[PDB]
């Protein structure tokens, strides 16, 4: 609320065929100490939406309670799968929250990504939802996908690839050089690994113990964390 203390590094989000891919290093640095090297920095609101994080951890946690409990209220007044809120809804909600906190001058020292799938014609997961506990992938049109961004100042937009932190110079350059449309999972993961390798080799606050999450027709898939090949 007054300044950053415990900081995360950066996240990368890209859309491809069958869904989107979002990645983040599991580390939160206490300045120049690196106290925590196993932190969950990618969160889930519901199926077909996730929340990114690069900044102060307390604000991300507060926004995580707000967003996940907004999803709880959505489920508690749900009757059909189409009544589930889209990533546009949550992205606008975070944008309004950041704008209001800016006007009050009590900001959140974070740079959020909201991304997922803004359509329901591809899977029947949301008709009978499963919060606690939990085929072939179905190709998803890029128009039905969505990736968004929220700045400290509330600035927002949408694009096929969005990154935060120091990845907005390194990884954004690699994506603008190399990002195609409808790349398979292997090519996307190779590109993400190359960008995170370049970040690890030239960013103190980053690391190699990477978390990777996917948002597809099957739903949100928290894969096993892996150390980068380097």
């Amino acid at each position: 609320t007054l300044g950053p203390v415990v900081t995360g590094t950066s996240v990368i989000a890209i859309k491809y065929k069958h869904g989107i891919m979002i990645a983040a290093d599991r580390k939160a640095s206490y300045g120049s100490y690196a106290k925590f090297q196993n932190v969950e920095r990618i969160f889930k609101i519901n199926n077909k939406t996730v929340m990114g994080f690069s900044g102060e951890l307390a604000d991300a946690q507060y926004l995580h309670e707000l967003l996940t409990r907004k999803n709880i209220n959505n489920l508690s007044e749900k009757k059909r799968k189409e009544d589930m809120y889209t990533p546009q809804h949550y992205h606008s909600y975070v944008s309004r929250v950041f704008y209001v906190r800016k006007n009050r001058i009590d900001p959140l020292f974070n740079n959020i990504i909201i991304a997922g799938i803004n359509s329901q014609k591809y899977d029947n997961n949301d008709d009978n939802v499963l919060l606690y506990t939990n085929e072939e992938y179905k190709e998803i049109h890029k128009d039905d996908l969505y990736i968004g961004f929220v700045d400290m100042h509330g600035t927002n937009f949408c694009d096929d690839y969005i990154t935060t932190g120091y990845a907005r110079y390194f990884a954004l350059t690699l994506l603008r050089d190399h990002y195609k449309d409808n790349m398979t999972e292997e090519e996307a993961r190779i590109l993400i690994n190359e960008c995170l390798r370049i970040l690890y080799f030239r960013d103190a606050t980053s690391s190699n113990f990477i978390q990777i999450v996917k948002v597809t027709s099957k739903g949100v898939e928290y894969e096993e964390p892996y150390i980068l090949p380097c």
Binding site: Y99, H153, T155, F157, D159
Partner: protein, 212 residues
């Protein structure tokens, strides 16, 4: 010790005629020395015969445009007729002055066509002052393009003079001006949307500029 003001940067160009108004703007968002995305339209359509463009903080212009569209839709619902451009101009003046002491970082241009088929153009500051014009520009490139519009439209410091102007020449002049701004300013953009308004509705085209 946090300053809630950043110039995302941009430019919006406006020009009028006998029975039309041309408004053009970039489609680049950015930060100080880096670009977020290559497509972020700042022009928001308000009515069938009115649009608004802006430059400055992206969040402030989005909130202002959506709030103004809310007020316009409530006005149509309560009063059963669309508001005129002068009405929208005074409403935006009152909205801007409501936040006098924490002002919007938004330099606005309000274009449209009056009920008498006259292309109007209002230009704003951050606080709320406004005045009708036949040519205006705001944003980072405002100092660049504004002398050029003064040379073309007003055409003072000239003796031979030529007032024969039509829609195509005005559009081409706007394309030349925004291209010159893109060459001569770093925040300007890479693709621009030339909104054109006429008695027969609204048309919108797109043009590709330099990517630097």
């Amino acid at each position: 010790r946090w300053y809630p003001y950043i110039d995302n940067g941009g430019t919006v160009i406006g020009l009028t005629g006998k029975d039309y108004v041309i408004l053009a703007a970039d489609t680049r968002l950015s930060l100080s020395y880096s670009i977020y995305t290559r497509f972020c339209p700042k022009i928001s359509k308000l009515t069938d015969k009115c649009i608004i463009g802006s430059s400055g903080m992206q969040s402030d212009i989005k909130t202002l445009h959506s709030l103004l569209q809310k007020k316009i839709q409530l006005f149509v619902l309560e009063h059963s007729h669309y508001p005129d451009i002068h009405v929208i101009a005074r409403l935006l003046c009152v909205i801007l002055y409501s936040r006098r002491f924490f002002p919007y970082y938004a330099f606005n241009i309000l274009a449209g066509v009056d009920e008498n088929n006259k292309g109007v153009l209002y230009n704003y500051d951050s606080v709320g002052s406004y005045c009708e014009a036949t040519h205006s520009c705001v944003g980072s490139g405002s100092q660049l393009i504004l002398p050029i519009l003064d040379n073309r439209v007003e055409q003072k410091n000239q003796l031979i003079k030529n007032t024969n102007f039509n829609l195509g020449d005005d559009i081409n002049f706007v394309k030349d001006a925004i291209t010159s701004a893109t060459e001569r300013d770093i925040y300007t953009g890479d693709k621009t949307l030339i909104y054109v308004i006429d008695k027969m509705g609204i048309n919108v085209n797109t043009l590709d500029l330099k990517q630097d």
